[PDB]
Design a binder for this molecule. Sequence first.
Ligand code: UDP
Ligand code: NAG
Length: 513
Amino acid sequence: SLAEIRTDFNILYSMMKKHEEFRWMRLRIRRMADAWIQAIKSLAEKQNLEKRKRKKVLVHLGLLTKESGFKIAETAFSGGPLGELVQWSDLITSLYLLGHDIRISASLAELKEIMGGGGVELIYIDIVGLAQFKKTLGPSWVHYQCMLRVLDSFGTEPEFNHANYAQSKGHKTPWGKWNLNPQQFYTMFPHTPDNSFLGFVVEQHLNSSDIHHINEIKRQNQSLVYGKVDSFWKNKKIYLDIIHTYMEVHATVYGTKNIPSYVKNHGILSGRDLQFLLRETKLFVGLGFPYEGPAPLEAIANGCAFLNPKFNPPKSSKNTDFFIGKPTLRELTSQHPYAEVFIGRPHVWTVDLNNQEEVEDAVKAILNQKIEPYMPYEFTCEGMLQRINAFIEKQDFCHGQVMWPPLSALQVKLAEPGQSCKQVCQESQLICEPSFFQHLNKDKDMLKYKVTCQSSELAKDILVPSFDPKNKHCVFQGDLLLFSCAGAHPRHQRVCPCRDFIKGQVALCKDCL
Ligand SMILES: O=c1ccn([C@@H]2O[C@H](COP(=O)(O)OP(=O)(O)O)[C@@H](O)[C@H]2O)c(=O)[nH]1
Ligand SMILES: *[C@@H]1O[C@H](CO)[C@@H](O)[C@H](O)[C@H]1NC(C)=O
C-alpha cells in the first residue's frame, strides 16, 4: 500500500506496447530513460519520498481514441503535432518512477473497465477525454470530478469554466463550461495562475564534455528555422534574408514555395537526429507560429539562442484566428512568452520581426555570444518529478487533506485599476494563488491586510473582491467559482492573493514540499 520508487522501465515498456498509438511516447521515454532514473534516485536522496500511499491512477489519453478522430499517432513520425504527446510521455514516466499504479487508457472500453474496477484515486485526462468520461460513466461522473487533473495546454480562465457566467458574458465558445475548480486544469507553461502548471521535460543529450567543448561542437554560423509546416513560412522572406546575411539557414520542413532557395532542408528528423542538429546549431529561428511549444526549450537546452518574434499588439482572441473560441482571454507578448520572461537574454532574443535593424543586431549579437546550454529546473526530470509528486501528495480538491498551499504563504497585494491579480503578483516577483481568495472575501478579513470597508456589497463577478479607496467601498464575491487571478478592474483596486515560489519551480511555494 506504500509507493516505492521504480528504477527500471521494463514494466512501463510492457504497458506501452499494448497500444500501437503509444509507439512515439515509448521511443521518447527510451531515449530519456538514463536521465529519468538518475533523477528519481537524486530526488529520493534529497527529499522525503518515504511513506507515500501508492495511488491507483487512471491516465485517459482522449487525443489517441479512435472516437476523437485526431490521427495524432498517424502524423507523430511525419511532422504532425507532438506537444501533447511530449507532456503525456513525461507525465506517465513521472507517475511510474514515483511508484504509482498507472492504468493507461486510449479507448472508451478501457476507460469504462478501469473506472468499473474501482479503487481509482486520481485521474489524468485531456479535454476530449473529459467529454468521453462524462458520456461513458453517465451522471455519477461528478462523483469523481474532484480526482480529475485536466491536461489543458493553453489554460482555462474562471470566466469560461463557469458555464452560466460564460453564457451571461456572451462567450459563444464550445470550450470551458466544466464548472471544475480551475486549479484542476494542468497547463503546458506557467501562463495561467488560475490553473496548475504541469509542463514536461526538455530532452537534451549533452554529456559533461559536450557542454564544456560546446564552442568547438557548434557551427557558429548555422541557424535552424522553427517551423515544420510550409504555411508557417508565409511572408518571412525579408526576416530570413537578414539572418541569411550572417548565417546558413537550415530547416526541418515536410512536403514548398514559402521556403527560399538558399534554405538547407533536412526534412522531418527523428528525435535523435533533431537533437544532433540542435547540438550543431548556433541560432534557432522563430517565425511567429506555433505558440508556446516545447521545440524552443530543446534548442536552448542544446546551447542554441532562440530568436523569439515579439507581438505588438500581444496576440489573443481579440486579434488572432487561432485564439478565437479558446476558453481564455490571455494575451501572448511573443511566440514563446515563457522563453521571453523566464529565460530572456542571452538565450532568448525577443525581437520585432518587422524591425530589420533590431533583427540584424540580435543576429550579430548572437554570433558574438558564448554558448551556455540552459534548462530551467522546472523542465528537468528532477524538477518535473518534484512538481508532480508535490501535486499528488498535497493537492486535494476532495476535502480529505490539510489546506495547500499553506495560509503562511499568502502575501496580499492591491492591483491598481487596469491591473489583474496575475500582473500585480508577477511584478512583485510573486504568483497569484487563487486558493487564497476565500480568505480575502469579507470586512473582518480585509482589516488584516490594512484595507478598511466603510460599505460593502456582494457581486458575482471575476473582478471581486474589489476596493474603491476613494469611497472606502468593498465588493465581495457572491459566487466562489468566479474567483479569478485573470481580469483587471477598470475603476477599482483588486484585492489579490499572491504567494512566493521556489526559484525555477513556480508551481510550488517555498513551504509547499
Ligand atoms: O524535425 C523535427 C522537428 C521537430 N521535432 C519535435 O517536435 C516536438 C514538438 O515541438 P513543436 O514545438 O514543433 O510542437 P508541436 O507544434 O509539434 O506541438 C519537439 O520535441 C521536436 O523535437 C521532431 O521530432 N523532428
Ligand atoms: C558559414 O561558415 C562556412 C564555414 O566557415 C562558410 O564557408 C560559409 O560561407 C558561411 N555561410 C554564411 C551564409 O555565412
